[PDB]
Paper text:
A key component in the generation of cellular metabolic energy is the F1Fo ATP synthase, a biological rotary motor that converts the proton motive force (pmf) to adenosine tri-phosphate (ATP) in both oxidative phosphorylation and photophosphorylation. The enzyme is comprised of two rotary motors, termed F1 and Fo, that are coupled together by two stalks: a central “rotor” stalk and a peripheral “stator” stalk. The Fo motor spans the membrane and converts the potential energy from the pmf into mechanical rotation of the central rotor that, in turn, drives conformational changes in the catalytic F1 motor subunits to generate ATP from ADP and inorganic phosphate (Pi). Here we have used cryo-Electron Microscopy (cryo-EM) on detergent-solubilized cysteine free E. coli ATP synthase13 to probe its structure and understand its rotational dynamics and coupling.
However, the reconstructions were still anisotropic due to preferential alignment to the F1-ATPase, so focused refinement using a mask of the Fo region was performed on Sub-state 3A resulting in a detailed map to 3.3 Å resolution of the Fo motor. This map enabled a detailed model of the membrane-embedded a, b and c subunits to be built, which was fitted and refined to all other sub-states. A particularly interesting feature seen in this study are the positions of aArg210 and cAsp61, residues that are known to be essential for proton translocation. Density for these residues was resolved particularly well and suggests them to be in close proximity to each other. Furthermore residues aAsn214, aHis245, aAsn119, and aGlu219, that are also known to be important from mutagenesis studies, form a chain of residues between the aqueous channel and rotation path of cAsp61. A deep funnel-like evagination can be observed on the cytoplasmic side of the membrane that likely facilitates deprotonation of the c-ring near aSer199, which is adjacent to cAsp61. When all the density corresponding to protein had been assigned, tube-like non-protein density likely corresponding to lipid molecules were observed in multiple locations within the membrane bound Fo-motor. The strongest of these densities were observed between residues aI225–aQ234 and a single c subunit, where three of these tubes of density were present on the periplasmic side and one on the cytoplasmic side of the enzyme. This additional density was observed in most of the maps but was clearest in the highest resolution maps, Sub-states 1C and 3A, and the focused Fo map of Sub-state 3A. Without the lipid(s), the interaction surface between subunit a and the c-ring would be limited to three of the ten c subunits, whereas with the lipid-mediated interaction this is increased by an additional c subunit to four.
Author numbering:
A (entry chain O), D (entry chain P), E (entry chain I), F (entry chain Q), G (entry chain L), H (entry chain J), ...: 3 to 79
B (entry chain Y): 1 to 50
C (entry chain a): 4 to 269
M (entry chain X): 1 to 47
C-alpha cells in the first residue's frame, strides 16, 4: 500500500519546517547577542546567560515537531 | 547535428575569449610581477647603500 | 556522422574507463557494475597537471637566487608568499605539513579547473580520431572521485591533528559534551558533532565537484544546442565568468583546508 | 488507506507552520530583549518581565495549533 | 472517507497559515515595544497600553481564521 | 463528495493567506508607530490618528479576501 | 462539473497572493511614513500627499489581480 | 473541458506571484523615498524623479507577468 | 491534450518566480540608492551610474528565467 | 506523453527558484555596495572589486541550478 | 514501486528545508559577527569564540534533518 | 517512463531550495563584509579572511543538498 | 556519478605529490625568500 510512504512524507514536511524555524530563530537571536557582546565585552557572561534563557523558548516548539517527526518515521511507519 | 559546425563555433568563441584574456587579464599579472621586481630592486639598493 | 544533439550532449558526459577485472576499456554503451573500473582520463590529467606543477616549482626552487629575481622566479615567489601569508594568518602551530599541503591544494586545483576553459571538443576530437579512444573528458575536478579523494585526504588529516594535539582527553570530550554541556545530552551531542565532523569533508568535495561539473555542463550545452554563428555570444560571457570561479574554488579549497586543520589542532 | 495518512499529513502542516511561527516570532522578540539588556544592564529584570508578557501572547496562538495537531494524530487518527 | 478526511487538511492549512501570521506579527510589534522600553524605562506603562491597543488589531484577522478552522474540524467534519 | 470539499479548501487557502497579509502588515506598521510613541510621547494622539488612517488601507484588501472566504463556505457551500 | 470548483480555487490563490502583497507593501510604506511623521510633525499633510501617491502604485498591480480573481469567481464560474 | 481549469489556474499563479513581486518591491523602494522626503523636504521633486526612474525597472518584469496572465485568460482560455 | 495545459502551468510558475525575484531585488537595491541620494544629492549621477551596473546583474538571472518561460509558452506551446 | 510535460515543470521549478535566489542575494549584496559607495566615493573601485569577488560566490550556486535546468529541459529528452 | 520513488521525493524536501534553514541562520549570525569585527578589530578572537559557540546551536537541528535525509535515501530507498 | 520523471522532480526540489538558501545566506553575510570594508578600508584583507571562514560554514549544508541532487539526476536517473 | 576505484588511485597520487612538495619545493623556496628578507632587515639595521 501507498500509506506507509505518505507517513515518511508527513514526517519530512514536519521536521524540515521545524529545522527552518529552529535555525533562523536562533540565527536572529544569536546575531543580536554577538552585537551586544561586541559593544560590552565585560558583559559576555551576563548576556550569554540571558541568551540561554530565551534560546530555550525558541527551541521549545521546534523540538516538539522534531520529536513527533522521529515518532512517525521510526515508530509508526 | 553537424559536428564540424560545433568545432567552428567553439573556435570563434575561443579566439574572442583569448583576445579578452590577453588585454584584461595579462596586463594586471605582468604589472604585479614588475611591481615586485621594482620593490625588490629598491629594497636591495637601499639595503646595500645603507 | 549520426548525432542528434541530445546524443552529442550524452556522449560528452561519458568518461573513459579501465575494467580491472580484464584491463579492457569499458565501452560507453554498457557499463560494468563493478567498483573496479578506474577512470583513465581524469587520472591522466590529474597526474600530468601535478607533475607540471612540481616541475615548474622545483626548477625555480633549485635555481632560486636572493638577488633581484627573474620574471618567472618572481611569479613563483608571489604564489609562495600568498600561500604562506594565508597560512600564517589562519594557523599558528609548529607543523611542517600545513604550508606545503596548502600550496599543492591551491596550485593543483587551479590547474585542474583551468583545463575546463579550453574548447570542449578539441582534446576529445584528438582522442577519438588520432588515438582512437572510445571517449574522453579532460577536467579532473569535474569528476567526483578526485574531489572526494582530496576531501577524504583532508578528513584523515583532521583526525590525525585532533588526536595528536589532544587525544584520550580532548577528542572524547568534544565528541560527547558539546554543544549542550550536561552529561544527560551525551547521545544527542555525539550525533550532532558526528554529523558536524562528517559535514566538513563531504562539503569540501561536493563544493568543488558541483561547481566544476555544472561549469563543464554549460559548455557542453552551449556547444551542443546552438548553431555555430551564435555560440560565441553566450560562450564568451560564460568563459569570462568561469575565470572568476576557477580561482575562487581553488582558493576556497585551500582556505577551508587550513581553517579545518587549524581549528582541529589548536 | 487515505484516512490515516491524510490525518498525519494535516498534523504535519499544523505543527510545521506552528514551529515556523513560534520560533521566528520569539527569535525577533528575543533579539530586541538582548539588545535592550546590553544597552541597559541595570534593567534585565524589568525588560525580562516585559519580554515574558509579550512572549505569552506570541506563543499562545501557535500553542492552539500544536495542541490541536496532537489531537489530530492521537485522538482522530 | 476522503471528503471529511480532507476537511481536516483544510482546517490545518487555514489555522497554520494564521499561526505564522499572528506569531510573526506580534513578534515584530513586541520587539519595537521592548526597544522603546529600553530607551525610555519610566515610560513602560504608556507604551504597554499602546502595544495592547495595536495587538488587538493584529490578532483580529488571525482569530477569525483560527475560529473558522476550529468550526471546520468540530462542526463541519 | 469532492466538489464541496474543494470549496472548503478554497476558503482555507484564501483566509490563510489573508491572515498572513493582515497580521504581518499591521505588525510592521504598529512597530513603527510604537517607536514614534517612545521617541515623543506627547505626540501619541496625533501619531495614533495617522496610524488608524494607514491601518485602514492595509487592512481593507485582506478584509475583502476574508469576506469572499466566508461567502464560499457559508453561501456557495 | 469539476470546472466550477477549480475556478473557485483559481480565484482563491489569485486573491490570497494579492492580499499578502498589498497588505505587506502598504505596511512597509506606512511604517516609514509614521516614523517620518514622528520626526517632522509639522510636515504630516505633505508626507500624506506623497504617501497617497506611492500607495497608488503599490495597489495598482494587486487591484488588477483582485479584479480578475473576482471576475473569475462571479462571471466565469 | 480540462483546458480551462488548468489555464485559469496558470493565470492565477502568474498574476498572484506578480502581485507579490510588484507590491513588495514598490513598498520597500517607496518607504526609502518617504524617509528621504522627511529627512530633506524641498528635495521632494528631485527624489520623486529618482523614485519614478527606479520604479520603472521594478515594475518592468511584473508587468510582463501581468500582460501574459491577461493573454492566458482572455486569448488562450 | 494535457501537455499544453501543463506547459502553460510551467511557464506561469517560472515567470511568476522570476517576477518576484527581479522586482524585490531591484526594490532593495533601489531603496539603498534613494537614501544615499537623500543624504547628499550632489552624488545622484555617480550613485545612479553604480546602480545601473549592479541592477544589470540583478536582472541577468531572472531574464534567463523569463526567456525560457516565453520559449515554453510560445514555442513548445 | 506525460513524461515531457512533467520534465518541463521540473525545469521550471529549478529555473524559478534559481531566479529568486540570485536576484534577492545580489539585491541585498548590491544595496550594501551602494551605501558603501555613497559613504566612501573615492573607494568605489576598491568596494566594486570586493563586490565582484563575493558576487561570484552568490551567483555560483544559482548557476548550478540553471545549468541542470537547461539540461532537463533541452537535453534529457 | 511507488513507495521507493516517493521516498526520494520525501528526502528531497527534508534536505531542501534543512539547506534554507542552515544557510539563512548562519548568514544572519555571521553577518553580525563580521560587522562587530569591523567595528571592534581588537575583539575578533573573543567574538570569533562566541560565534562558534552560538553557531553550534544553529547547526544542531539542521544536522538532524540532513542526517535523516541521507538515511531515507540510502537505507530505506 | 514513469519512475524517472518523479526522480527529476525530486532533484528539482533539492537544487531549487538549496540555491535559494545558499545565495541569500551568502548575500546577507557578504553585505556585512562590504559594510565593514567601507567603514574601515585598512581592515579589508583581515575582514576578507573572516568572510571566507564564515562563508565556508554558510554554504557547507547547502552543498550536501546540491551534491545529492546531482547524484539523483546523474546516478539514480 | 559513479563512485569508483579512482578514489583510491587519486589518494595515492595526492600523498606522493604532497611529500615531494613538502621536502623539495617548500624548504628551498622559503629559504631563498627569507634569506632576502633578512638581508633587507640588516639593511635597515645599518640605519
Amino acid at each position: 500500500n501507498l500509506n506507509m510512504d505518505l507517513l515518511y512524507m508527513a514526517a519530512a514536511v514536519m521536521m524540515g519546517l521545524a529545522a527552518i524555524g529552529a535555525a533562523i530563530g536562533i540565527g536572529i537571536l544569536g546575531g543580536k547577542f554577538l552585537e551586544g557582546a561586541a559593544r560590552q565585552p565585560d558583559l559576555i557572561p551576563l548576556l550569554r546567560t540571558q541568551f540561554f534563557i530565551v534560546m530555550g523558548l525558541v527551541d521549545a516548539i521546534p523540538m516538539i515537531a522534531v520529536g513527533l517527526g522521529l515518532y512517525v518515521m521510526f515508530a509508526v511507519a | 547535428m553537424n559536428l564540424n559546425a560545433t568545432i567552428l563555433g567553439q573556435a570563434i568563441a575561443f579566439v574572442l575569449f583569448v583576445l579578452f584574456c590577453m588585454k584584461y587579464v595579462w596586463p594586471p599579472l605582468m604589472a604585479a610581477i614588475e611591481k615586485r621586481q621594482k620593490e625588490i630592486a629598491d629594497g636591495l639598493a637601499s639595503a646595500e647603500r645603507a | 556522422e549520426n548525432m542528434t544533439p541530445q546524443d552529442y550532449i550524452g556522449h560528452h558526459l561519458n568518461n573513459l574507463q579501465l575494467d580491472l577485472r580484464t584491463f579492457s576499456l569499458v565501452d560507453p554503451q554498457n557499463p560494468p557494475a563493478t567498483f573496479w573500473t578506474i577512470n583513465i582520463d581524469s587520472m591522466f590529467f590529474s597526474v600530468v597537471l601535478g607533475l607540471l606543477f612540481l616541475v615548474l616549482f622545483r626548477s625555480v626552487a633549485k635555481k632560486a637566487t636572493s638577488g633581484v629575481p627573474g620574471k618567472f622566479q618572481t611569479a613563483i615567489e608571489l604564489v609562495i608568499g600568498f600561500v604562506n601569508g594565508s597560512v600564517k594568518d589562519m594557523y599558528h602551530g609548529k607543523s611542517k605539513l600545513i604550508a606545503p599541503l596548502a600550496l599543492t591544494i591551491f596550485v593543483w586545483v587551479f590547474l585542474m579547473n583551468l583545463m575546463d576553459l579550453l574548447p570542449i571538443d578539441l582534446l576529445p576530437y584528438i582522442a577519438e580520431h588520432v588515438l582512437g579512444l572510445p571517449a574522453l573528458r579532460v577536467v579532473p575536478s569535474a569528476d567526483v572521485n578526485v574531489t572526494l579523494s582530496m576531501a577524504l585526504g583532508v578528513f584523515i588529516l583532521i583526525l590525525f591533528y585532533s588526536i595528536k594535539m589532544k587525544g584520550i582527553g580532548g577528542f572524547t570530550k568534544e565528541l560527547t559534551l558539546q554543544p549542550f554541556n550536561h552529561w544527560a545530552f551525551i547521545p544527542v551531542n555525539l550525533i550532532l558533532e558526528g554529523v558536524s565532523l562528517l559535514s566538513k569533508p563531504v562539503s569540501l568535495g561536493l563544493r568543488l565537484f558541483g561547481n566544476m561539473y555544472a561549469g563543464e555542463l554549460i559548455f557542453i550545452l552551449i556547444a551542443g544546442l546552438l548553431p555555430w554563428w551564435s555560440q560565441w555570444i553566450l560562450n564568451v560571457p560564460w568563459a569570462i565568468f568561469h575565470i572568476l570561479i576557477i580561482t575562487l574554488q581553488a582558493f576556497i579549497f585551500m582556505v577551508l583546508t587550513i581553517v579545518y586543520l587549524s581549528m582541529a589542532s589548536e
